[PDB]
RNA sequence: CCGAUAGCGAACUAGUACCGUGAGGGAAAGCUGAAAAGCACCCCGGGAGGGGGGUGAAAAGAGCCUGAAACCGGGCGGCG
RNA sequence: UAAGGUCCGGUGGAGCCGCCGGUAUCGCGGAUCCUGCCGGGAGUAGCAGCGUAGUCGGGUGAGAAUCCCGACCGCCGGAG
RNA sequence: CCGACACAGGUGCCCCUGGGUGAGAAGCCUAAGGCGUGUCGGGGGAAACCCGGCCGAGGGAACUCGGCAAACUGGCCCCGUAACUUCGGGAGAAGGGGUGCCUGCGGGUGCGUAACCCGCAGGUCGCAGUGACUAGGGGGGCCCGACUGUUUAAUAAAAA
RNA sequence: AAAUAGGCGGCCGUUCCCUGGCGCUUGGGCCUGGGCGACCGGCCCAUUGCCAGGGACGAGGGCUCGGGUAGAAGACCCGGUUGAUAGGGCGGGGAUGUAAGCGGGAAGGGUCAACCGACCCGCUUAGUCCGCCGCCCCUAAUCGCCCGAGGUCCUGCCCC
């Protein structure tokens, strides 16, 4: 798939117990990366703001149990990738 | 020393705790022949359930209602792919050679819409093709040869000892794997000639539960146990607690020996693996054997099974199963062979087909 | 200095290196491994160590670390840094190659030695009023790189 | 007579650095080359780092005369 | 016999032997020796325990988890 | 600063009246103000084992030199309070009850409806109303020493 | 890894050319005198074989990716589009116990009016949630790397 748009919900789920409890907000972000790269096949991709002010809005400790993203496509120039996601949250 | 003893913690009759040769069950030990019937059988352990019977199963009444927890396992239909024979040497048994069917039926499969390629799944046994053991490379000649090599041995004849089946199994609604799990079965008659017929019969044939087994008959388990990764001493072996109020000791063994001898024991509890370790359980006693489940139109001999949404840990129940009685040795999901009990109890009867007063229809969970 | 035969002029190519602040352990591992190669194998399996994909095996210096997977001894790990730094001693030996006319490319890695150069020595503190070294190994790695083809 | 782990505490930045509240205690640290020509010019390198060319001779290239042993890499022979 | 002598090759680039008579701060394997240098230990332990803190965009730079700006999330509250 | 160390140490004052809380310079939360350099990161849902800590049926010290450790009680209000006695005390004995929110009143001090504080009745929810944090387990015999204090600054705080 | 170092079934590796030199070197059949025979001598054949100079092809397996019935690392097990492995969506099965809003009632108090109200009921077997199962290929199981040979140095059994 090329050109845009997906909106995916990436389960958050693997963040408790993975690795603890308040620092589940660390790792929740290392997920939404990891998703969104993976269904992307593509690099660390950029995830806006409004994803992390999501995960972390109860704190580090509470991080939610889904969290709906809103993903693109796009190329660059110069040489280089496919590779480059601009992702924010819907 | 108080001069009392202490009975030992552990078996090393079921040491040393380590890992499976394979995940696949291992066999040497064969029961009783007395029938030209198929030895030893496979399912899948599905998950488990409790049941009510009428006792049968003689005790304390023989008459009165009596509880008894359920493994039920689906067992897959099996297909064997070959016969094995073996000659008798001088130090041991060994295979003088196999016949095997290289040759191909499309496979009872199905699945899968989409759809515009189909793309045929019509199985040459393409599961022999996922399953990793080889295949000529001329299908017609390469039987023909080798039942050629099995004529001669009939022939000769006494050269010839027993006879075992090859026998895969076929995954055609399990989904737990896709790539057969392959065994050795024993095939008991009395005299070589009697197992030669049969097995030569069997090889093109899915067969049942029915077929092997019947109800109400005591059966020994075999598998390899689920595994636990590494445990501790307190674990593995059993250890009891000591005095007034221990922060710094409270799972430990203390002494693991003397100053001489300048040696360690190996009967001294340590950590290790735990589980993942083959056990064979005697005297289990066989509940039910049908088909499906949900759903029969009769309503004696079960009504049908499954609790609805499932197990957890296993897909959809719908091919031959059997539901044993009390506890079988494995994980959810993990192969297990079924072995005929080499001898029962005499202390206790078995009674054919026991009475089956009611059966859950509740989720584990 | 060098520490092997030279034919300069159309046969071999050379470059070295002095006082990198490196492990020379983990300079073992990689001279080692590398040995025998071609360049540009060389920087592709230097490129691949940096990655963190493919691992370096330990082998003569193994102790107390963690297996890794696949073909190649049991024990091995990544040296980073020491990727990094090699790598700019082998870029040293290509500019270098193509002036005195060879062509750097095709040149098997006839010799990698590592050699354990000076100390920084100091201190950091332990209990007991006691103070005890705390060291920094300074290294010198030499390549020199033969012409091979037909 | 000794000759730089020796002989004066100390061949020198010594009664220094440093220790100790103080009284007092107290080291180590010598050698380019004929000439500084103490590294221009040229190639490379993020590079104050490092490599090639440049000196009668650089195992004379900056605590630079010689340059051992322990010990460390590589290579050769042999064993494995 | 030997304590030790002598010759060749490489290295080194200014001093050195023999004989005879003398003389001694005169020969080193040990001294929980003294001092100096070095390896294994290890690429291990520590870089954890006390009220457990960072994180996303962006700026800069050869190199940025720990430099800076904003946002977001916290601790502290006679004390961080 | 001093401890060789940018040492969890420990050295004087002052801000001791920030807001909420509640008897409080208490805890927690939070404001001005400060910081995220009590300066190494990441990974394995992280298995054994070890430290801090949470929860354990039934039983209720069977453990052990020893209830050591730990638990329990718990704030506050009311009731009630033994042996003994140097009549001062014991005593907060002991044991029993209550405590939330709302709605509406009364009293005290004042001045006129402020600022607080102390009671009373009704309605009503939860397993639990000091719901958190804060927060004594109790009782009896005996030995010693009157007490409070001091002691081996750093294995003995005691009867010395 | 039992050194008497196993047994089976399948899969694999299982090569060329010019030019020069050699061939009872390598291999077979026949005649006759000698030999039991191998062998000597005579006759017949080789697209062949050998040395020197250059030269092909690549079975298995890991690494890789999605997860675990597995697990300290490593290993193990399964799936990888010839597919339902993981996630989404939906639906099935489970955990909790009635959501937000609104509407009515509600101790009372008030010009008993606009209303202030803890709480109760209806909406609503609601709402919120799942480490499980099914449907379903939408999304992600891509992309790509490697190590590992070359009927075997020499001998004997049967043919060549």
Same mark, same amino acid.
């Given at each position: 798939?090329?050109?845009?748009?997906?909106?995916?919900?990436?389960?958050?789920?693997?963040?408790?117990?993975?690795?603890?409890?308040?620092?589940?907000?660390?790792?929740?972000?290392?997920?939404?990366?990891?998703?969104?790269?993976?269904?992307?096949?593509?690099?660390?991709?950029?995830?806006?703001?409004?994803?992390?002010?999501?995960?972390?809005?109860?704190?580090?400790?509470?991080?939610?149990?889904?969290?709906?993203?809103?993903?693109?496509?796009?190329?660059?120039?110069?040489?280089?990738?496919?590779?480059?996601?601009?992702?924010?949250?819907? | 020393?108080?001069?009392?003893?202490?009975?030992?913690?552990?078996?090393?009759?079921?040491?040393?705790?380590?890992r499976a040769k394979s995940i696949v069950p291992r066999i040497?030990?064969?029961?009783?022949?007395?029938?030209?019937?198929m030895?030893g059988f496979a399912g899948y352990k599905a998950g488990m359930?409790?049941?009510?019977?009428?006792?049968?199963?003689?005790?304390?009444?023989?008459?009165?209602?009596?509880?008894?927890?359920?493994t039920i396992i689906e067992t897959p239909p099996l297909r064997v792919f070959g016969?094995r024979?073996?000659?008798?040497?001088?130090?041991?048994?060994?295979?003088?050679?196999?016949?095997i069917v290289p040759?191909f039926p499309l496979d009872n499969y199905p699945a899968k819409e989409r759809?515009?390629?189909?793309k045929p799944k019509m199985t040459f046994y393409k599961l022999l093709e996922r399953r990793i053991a080889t295949l000529?490379?001329?299908?017609?000649?390469?039987?023909?040869?080798?039942?050629?090599?099995?004529?001669?041995?009939?022939?000769?004849?006494?050269?010839?000892?027993?006879?075992?089946a090859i026998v895969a199994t076929q995954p055609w609604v399990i989904k737990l794997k896709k790539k057969p799990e392959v065994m050795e079965y024993?095939?008991?008659?009395?005299?070589?000639?009697?197992?030669?017929?049969?097995?030569?019969?069997?090889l093109?044939k899915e067969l049942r539960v029915?077929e092997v087994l019947?109800?109400?008959?005591?059966?020994?388990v075999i598998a390899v146990t689920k595994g636990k990764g590494?445990?501790?001493?307190?674990?593995?072996?059993?250890?009891?607690?000591?005095?007034?109020?221990?922060?710094?000791?409270?799972?430990?063994?203390?002494?693991?020996?003397?100053?001489?001898?300048?040696?360690?024991?190996?009967?001294?509890?340590?950590?290790?693996?735990?589980g993942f370790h083959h056990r064979t359980?005697?005297?289990?006693?066989?509940?039910?054997?049908?088909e499906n489940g949900?759903?029969?139109?009769?309503?004696?001999?079960?009504?049908?099974i499954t609790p609805?949404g499932g197990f957890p840990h296993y897909g959809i129940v719908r091919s031959d199963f059997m539901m044993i009685?009390?506890?079988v040795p494995g994980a959810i999901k993990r192969i297990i062979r079924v072995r005929?009990?080499?001898?029962?109890?005499?202390?206790?009867?078995?009674?054919?087909?026991?009475?089956?007063?009611?059966?859950?229809?509740?989720?584990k969970? | 200095?060098?520490?092997?035969?030279?034919?300069?002029?159309?046969?071999?190519?050379?470059?070295?290196?002095?006082?990198?602040?490196?492990?020379?352990?983990?300079?073992?591992?990689?001279?080692?491994?590398?040995?025998?190669?071609? @360049?540009?194998?060389?920087?592709?399996?230097?490129?691949?160590?940096? /990655?963190? %994909?493919? $691992? +370096?095996?330990?082998?003569? #210096?193994?102790?107390?670390?963690?297996?890794?997977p696949?073909?190649?001894?049991?024990?091995?790990?990544?040296?980073?840094?020491?990727?990094?730094?090699?790598?700019?001693?082998?870029?040293?030996?290509?500019?270098?190659?193509?002036?005195?006319? @060879?062509?750097?490319?095709?040149?098997?890695?006839?010799?990698?030695? /590592?050699? %354990?150069? $000076? +100390?920084?020595?100091?201190? #950091?503190?332990?209990?007991?009023?006691?103070?005890?070294?705390?060291?920094?190994?300074?290294?010198?790695?030499?390549?020199?790189?033969?012409?091979?083809?037909?």
């Amino acid at each position: 798939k090329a050109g845009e748009e997906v909106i995916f919900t990436v389960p958050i789920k693997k963040i408790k117990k993975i690795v603890p409890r308040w620092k589940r907000a660390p790792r929740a972000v290392k997920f939404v990366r990891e998703f969104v790269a993976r269904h992307a096949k593509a690099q660390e991709v950029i995830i806006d703001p409004k994803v992390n002010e999501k995960i972390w809005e109860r704190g580090i400790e509470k991080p939610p149990s889904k969290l709906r993203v809103k993903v693109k496509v796009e190329e660059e120039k110069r040489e280089g990738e496919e590779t480059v996601r601009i992702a924010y949250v819907t | 020393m108080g001069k009392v003893h202490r009975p030992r913690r552990g078996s090393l009759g079921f040491s040393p705790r380590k890992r499976a040769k394979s995940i696949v069950p291992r066999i040497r030990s064969w029961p009783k022949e007395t029938e030209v019937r198929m030895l030893g059988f496979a399912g899948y352990k599905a998950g488990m359930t409790h049941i009510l019977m009428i006792d049968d199963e003689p005790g304390l009444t023989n008459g009165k209602e009596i509880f008894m927890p359920v493994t039920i396992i689906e067992t897959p239909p099996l297909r064997v792919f070959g016969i094995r024979a073996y000659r008798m040497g001088y130090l041991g048994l060994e295979t003088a050679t196999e016949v095997i069917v290289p040759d191909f039926p499309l496979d009872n499969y199905p699945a899968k819409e989409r759809k515009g390629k189909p793309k045929p799944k019509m199985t040459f046994y393409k599961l022999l093709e996922r399953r990793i053991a080889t295949l000529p490379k001329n299908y017609t000649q390469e039987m023909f040869e080798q039942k050629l090599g099995q004529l001669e041995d009939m022939i000769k004849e006494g050269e010839i000892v027993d006879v075992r089946a090859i026998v895969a199994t076929q995954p055609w609604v399990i989904k737990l794997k896709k790539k057969p799990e392959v065994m050795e079965y024993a095939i008991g008659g009395t005299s070589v000639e009697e197992k030669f017929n049969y097995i030569k019969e069997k090889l093109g044939k899915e067969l049942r539960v029915g077929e092997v087994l019947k109800e109400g008959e005591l059966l020994d388990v075999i598998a390899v146990t689920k595994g636990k990764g590494t445990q501790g001493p307190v674990k593995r072996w059993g250890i009891k607690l000591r005095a007034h109020k221990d922060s710094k000791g409270r799972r430990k063994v203390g002494s693991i020996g003397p100053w001489h001898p300048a040696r360690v024991m190996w009967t001294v509890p340590m950590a290790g693996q735990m589980g993942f370790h083959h056990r064979t359980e005697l005297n289990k006693r066989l509940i039910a054997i049908g088909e499906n489940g949900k759903l029969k139109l009769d309503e004696n001999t079960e009504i049908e099974i499954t609790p609805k949404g499932g197990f957890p840990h296993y897909g959809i129940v719908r091919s031959d199963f059997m539901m044993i009685a009390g506890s079988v040795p494995g994980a959810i999901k993990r192969i297990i062979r079924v072995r005929p009990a080499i001898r029962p109890p005499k202390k206790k009867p078995p009674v054919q087909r026991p009475q089956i007063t009611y059966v859950s229809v509740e989720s584990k969970q | 200095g060098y520490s092997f035969q030279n034919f300069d002029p159309k046969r071999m190519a050379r470059a070295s290196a002095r006082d990198l602040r490196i492990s020379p352990k983990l300079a073992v591992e990689v001279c080692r491994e590398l040995r025998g190669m071609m @360049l540009n194998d060389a920087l592709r399996y230097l490129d691949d160590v940096i /990655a963190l %994909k493919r $691992p +370096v095996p330990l082998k003569r #210096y193994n102790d107390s670390q963690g297996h890794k997977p696949g073909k190649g001894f049991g024990p091995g790990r990544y040296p980073v840094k020491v990727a990094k730094a090699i790598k700019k001693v082998l870029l040293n030996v290509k500019n270098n190659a193509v002036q005195k006319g @060879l062509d750097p490319d095709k040149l098997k890695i006839i010799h990698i030695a /590592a050699h %354990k150069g $000076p +100390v920084l020595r100091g201190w #950091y503190p332990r209990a007991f009023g006691r103070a005890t070294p705390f060291n920094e190994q300074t290294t010198h790695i030499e390549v020199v790189v033969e012409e091979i083809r037909r």
